[PDB]
Enzyme design. Structure first.
Site: not given
Ligand SMILES: *Cc1cc2c(cc1C)nc1c(=O)[nH]c(=O)nc-1n2C[C@H](O)[C@H](O)[C@H](O)COP(=O)(O)OP(=O)(O)OC[C@H]1O[C@@H](n2cnc3c(N)ncnc32)[C@H](O)[C@@H]1O
Ligand SMILES: O=C(O)[C@@H]1CSCN1
Ligand SMILES: O=C(O)[C@@H]1CSCN1
Ligand SMILES: [Cl-]
Length: 381
Positions: A44, A47-48, A264, A268, A314, A347
């Site tokens: 959430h 944007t990414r 925004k 990191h 996040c 990404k």
């Molecule tokens: C937090 C964050 C991450 C981030 C970023 C900025 C922030 C503040 N900026 C990024 C960017 O600009 N570019 C990019 O490439 N990455 C960036 N990131 C990282 C990225 O968002 C994360 O690496 C990625 O979202 C990880 O994805 P993943 O699929 O691993 O995680 P998730 O989307 O949270 O999904 C996990 C799901 O699992 C469910 N869950 C958890 N426990 C359970 C159980 N027990 N049973 C069933 N489901 C479960 C969660 O609810 C969730 O939906």
């Molecule tokens: O993976 C990226 O591009 C961004 C910039 S540092 C946090 N995630």
């Protein structure tokens, strides 16, 4: 129903995998603790960034480029907005950023289209940036910004139309793996399939023990802020870019204002170590939340340092080497693990969905995923 495949965690990686499996007529169940997209995981804050020239390592470039093409394909398949081509600016002090240097090497090794700039050329090209004269930069015009919640929502709607089932608000509590079948246990019932994909984000750190895996994974609390900005400088409509930059006290990233939402920013390389079941999800409960962001803005982007319009909280999930885990379970070839995306995975989620589908269906992938091996030495303490 005995499914073909169960995906546990229908977030960034799991929902992409579910789309890929459904599109091939594979009977898939996805189970999520919430109802994705949501604000409790790692996807959430709207944007990414997607970069192609990759400062974490040139070996990521092929997966980035494939992911980029898959995002364009998604754009054409849904009515939700997926991608805008902001370009991505990378800068740092000349000679003092390994991240900048590897970005530059990655671009050369893959013949990526980039512009190289230094000092006042940066400040001249993008009014609103004020870097010292001893900084240098690499700008990638054809990368940009993904609308991550929209990505997951689109993949979900497309997968479900093809017959995938998504069981929401349901926590997986335990696993039972056999040579020829997999089983999950939840408070809303138990389910079976031929193959399992495990993609639970920050909760991988707590629940992979139930698959007899011991892998260092640390969840981190990572905030972002949206700030009232000079729209004549910082709007996407005047070509202000996405950015990921290194300064002496770490790496910061951010986004142009879209439709007046404000620039925004995130920091990191620092965050609080947390547990995903007890993290404080309110922005501003720690003074560092806002202060670390304004410390950057007042120095480098001084017209983007107005009132705080919005904050978000996040999670990252880091490995020891900050490279992902994408592999079969070492003792169970019918179990696929996606974990440890270390703050830079979104990404790639389109491409990772494709990999995970290949691993689940065939036990192999056409992609080179050696650097994400679950058996590599640098994962371990
Ligand atoms: C937090 C964050 C991450 C981030 C970023 C900025 C922030 C503040 N900026 C990024 C960017 O600009 N570019 C990019 O490439 N990455 C960036 N990131 C990282 C990225 O968002 C994360 O690496 C990625 O979202 C990880 O994805 P993943 O699929 O691993 O995680 P998730 O989307 O949270 O999904 C996990 C799901 O699992 C469910 N869950 C958890 N426990 C359970 C159980 N027990 N049973 C069933 N489901 C479960 C969660 O609810 C969730 O939906
Ligand atoms: O993976 C990226 O591009 C961004 C910039 S540092 C946090 N995630
Ligand atoms: O805190 C960290 O970054 C590492 C990631 S796994 C164990 N500790
Ligand atoms: Cl992450």
């Amino acid at each position: 129903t005995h499914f073909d495949v169960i995906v546990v965690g229908a977030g960034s990686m799991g929902m992409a995998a579910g789309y890929q499996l459904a599109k091939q007529g594979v009977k898939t169940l996805l189970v999520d603790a919430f109802d994705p997209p949501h604000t409790n995981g790692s996807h959430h804050g709207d944007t990414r960034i997607i970069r192609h020239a990759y400062g974490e390592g040139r070996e990521y470039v092929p997966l980035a480029l494939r992911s980029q093409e898959l995002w364009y394909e998604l754009e054409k398949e849904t009515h939700h907005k997926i991608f805008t081509k902001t370009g991505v600016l990378v800068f740092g002090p000349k000679g003092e950023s390994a991240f900048v240097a590897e970005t530059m090497e990655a671009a050369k090794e893959h013949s990526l289209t980039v512009d190289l700039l230094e000092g006042d050329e940066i400040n001249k090209r993008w009014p609103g940036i004020t870097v010292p004269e001893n900084y240098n930069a690499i700008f990638e015009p054809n990368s940009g910004v993904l609308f991550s919640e929209n990505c997951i929502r689109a993949y979900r709607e497309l997968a479900e139309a093809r017959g995938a089932k998504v069981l929401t608000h349901t926590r997986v509590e335990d696993f039972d793996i056999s040579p020829d079948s997999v089983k999950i246990e939840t408070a809303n019932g138990s389910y079976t399939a031929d193959k399992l994909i495990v993609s639970m984000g920050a909760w991988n750190s707590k629940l992979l023990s139930k698959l007899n895996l011991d892998i260092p994974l640390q969840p981190y609390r990572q905030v972002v802020g949206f700030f009232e900005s000079d729209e004549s400088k910082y709007s996407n409509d005047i070509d202000f870019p996405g950015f990921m930059v290194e300064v002496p006290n770490g790496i910061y990233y951010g986004f142009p204002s879209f439709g007046g939402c404000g620039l925004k920013l995130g920091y990191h390389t620092f965050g609080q170590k947390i547990d995903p079941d007890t993290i404080n999800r309110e922005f501003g409960v720690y003074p560092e939340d806002e202060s670390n962001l304004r410390a950057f803005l007042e120095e480098y982007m001084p017209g983007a340092n107005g009132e705080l319009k919005r904050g978000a909280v996040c999670m990252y999930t880091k490995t020891l080497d900050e490279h992902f885990i994408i592999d079969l379970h070492p003792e169970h070839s019918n179990v696929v693990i996606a974990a440890g995306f270390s703050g830079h995975g979104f990404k790639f989620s389109s491409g990772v969905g494709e990999v995970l589908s290949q691993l689940a269906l065939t036990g192999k992938t056409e992609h080179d995923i050696s650097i994400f091996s679950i058996n590599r030495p640098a994962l371990k303490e």
